[PDB]
Write a protein that binds this ligand. Structure first.
Ligand SMILES: CN1C(=O)CCc2cc(N)ccc21
Length: 123
């Protein structure tokens, strides 16, 4: 149907915008601390602490499969990256502090992204 194609175009456009957002957020992690999943080989107790791991590579996989239906779902995953890190690591660590900086700087990006998603009407 034509309506289905139109919806898929909207999702494709949302995916394009989120790809831009993802690139901007990842730039606020210059250390690449959040680039990949935490290694369960190197950190074997991680899943005892963190029930829903997340990282930028995993987000990118879901994004390219057009697996984010709206901005809220995307933000949920970004918040997992930050929140997981701030629980597993103590305040006085390079990991926790990287998460705080990513949260603070990323908030600016996500604030305007919400306006753009609403404005263009991608949901
Ligand atoms: C994000 N993160 C942690 O939360 C602590 C465990 C860890 C190890 C390595 N190698 C990179 C990142 C992390």
């Amino acid at each position: 149907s034509m309506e289905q194609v139109a919806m898929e175009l909207r999702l494709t456009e949302l995916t394009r915008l989120l790809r831009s957002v993802l690139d901007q957020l990842q730039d606020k992690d210059p250390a690449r601390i959040f680039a990949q999943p935490v290694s369960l080989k190197e950190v074997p107790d991680y899943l005892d602490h963190i029930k829903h791991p997340m990282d930028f590579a995993t987000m990118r996989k879901r994004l390219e499969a057009q697996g984010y239906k709206n901005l809220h779902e995307f933000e949920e995953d970004f918040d997992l990256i930050i929140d997981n890190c701030m629980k597993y690591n103590a305040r006085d660590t390079v990991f926790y502090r990287a998460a705080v900086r990513l949260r603070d700087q990323g908030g600016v990006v996500l604030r305007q992204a919400r306006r753009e998603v609403d404005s263009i009407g991608l949901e």
